Amino acid sequence: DPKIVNIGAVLSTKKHEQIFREAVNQANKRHFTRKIQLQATSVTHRPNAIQMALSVCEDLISSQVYAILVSHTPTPISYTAGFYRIPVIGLTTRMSIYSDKSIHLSFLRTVPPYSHQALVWFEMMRLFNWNHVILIVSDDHEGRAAQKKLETLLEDQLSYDNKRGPKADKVLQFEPGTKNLTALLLEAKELEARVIILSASEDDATAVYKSAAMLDMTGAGYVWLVGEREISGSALRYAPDGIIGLQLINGKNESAHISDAVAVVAQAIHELFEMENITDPPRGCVGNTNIWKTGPLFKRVLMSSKYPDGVTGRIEFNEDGDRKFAQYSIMNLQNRKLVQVGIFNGSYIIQNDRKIIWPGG
Ligand SMILES: *[C@@H]1O[C@H](CO)[C@@H](O[C@@H]2O[C@H](CO)[C@@H](O[C@@H]3O[C@H](CO)[C@@H](O)[C@H](O)[C@@H]3O)[C@H](O)[C@H]2NC(C)=O)[C@H](O)[C@H]1NC(C)=O
Ligand SMILES: *[C@@H]1O[C@H](CO)[C@@H](O)[C@H](O)[C@H]1NC(C)=O
Ligand SMILES: *[C@@H]1O[C@H](CO)[C@@H](O)[C@H](O)[C@H]1NC(C)=O
Ligand SMILES: [K+]
């Protein structure tokens, strides 16, 4: 007699589906009830967008899932499920587009968008009194989201220094995929400030680094401050010694995010079922143009939910459905090896015992 409540997932490997089932099992044990029983339904990723979308319909929506967890585009899944207002919960995708206020309105996620790295840059600027910076961003959605985020952060018996706040003397943008960025770097060289912040893809970061090298701008006096993509994979080849980048703590731990996302979903499902006039999700896509009437409400329940005991830390989502209070390892390139010199713990920079080597040091 328990009502079966299916949770869906699209995960990377069979082993992660096992982690998913175990999480759903844990959730049933956590919440005693005879009115509903949580069930796990999952698939792994298909090789292309078309097959992925079809599988979402054939394998997941056909089982009447209430939500779909998705590891790392999640684009076909977000769109296919969003059509019906079934919440899609991204476990590892960091691209800022999913945070946009106009599209992907059924999506939320347990990791922050790359644009949120700007919070950490801000604290770094405060800690080391970098009051003048140059921001170089790719002229695409991701580059501009980083810019927008950083700018937002920038914009009687007790004495105050009242020092003018940190400031971006200039924002320079480049066309993604451009192989020769000499003109841009020279434009930056003409400027006073020697603190350079970069938002760029792995591929574009290399272009920036090579141009900075050619112009002798990676040596003493300069500071390079970047995010995670700009010190990942191929971007590390020409990354200047002394550069500072970031790694999202637990950011690639799919297993941990599956556990936390299931916990959040189960909690929200129990709250949902205390409400009157709840409706069942769609059973299948074929000739079905109806939305899940309760879909939008369930997403609101999910996004306003709080799960303090996550394995990835406290879980809360902001108004765009992005994870709040993310923690980041602060990485410093030393002898061509990334060295962790501290943590941004959600609000403050906590330095450790290792010392930072600055560019040319
Ligand atoms: C990130 O680092 C910051 C700074 O160390 C941490 O904030 C600090 O947290 C402690 C413990 O919660 C706070 O102490 C407590 O403050 C309250 C009142 O505000 C009081 O009732 C407690 O008994 C105790 O004194 C401390 O004030 C706070 N400091 C700052 C600067 O806010 C924070 O906990 C770290 N975050 C994580 C997730 O680790
Ligand atoms: C990922 O997180 C899980 C917690 O479920 C932990 O058991 C595992 O050690 C983590 N893996 C890595 C490489 O951090
Ligand atoms: C749900 O719908 C019923 C039937 O119209 C209505 O009487 C009731 O007030 C509604 N319950 C809530 C809490 O909205
Ligand atoms: K969105």
Describe the structure.
This is Glutamate receptor ionotropic, NMDA 1. Glycans are attached at residues 39, 180, 253, 277, 327, 345. The chain folds into two domains: 1-112 and 255-326, Response regulator (Rossmann fold, 3-Layer(aba) Sandwich); 113-254 and 327-361, Response regulator (Rossmann fold). The strands form four sheets. A five-stranded parallel beta sheet has the order 2-1-3-4-5, sandwiched between helices. It has helices spanning 14-30, 49-60, 75-82, 117-127, 141-154, 182-189, 202-214, 254-272, 295-303; strands at residues 3-11, 36-44, 65-70, 88-90, 107-109, 132-138, 167-174, 195-199, 223-226, 244-248, 307-310, 313-315, 328-334, 337-344, 349-351. It contains nine helices and 15 strands. The termini are far apart. One 2-acetamido-2-deoxy-beta-D-glucopyranose binds at residues 253, 255-256, 259, 311. A molecule of 3 linked components (NAG-NAG-BMA) binds next to loops.
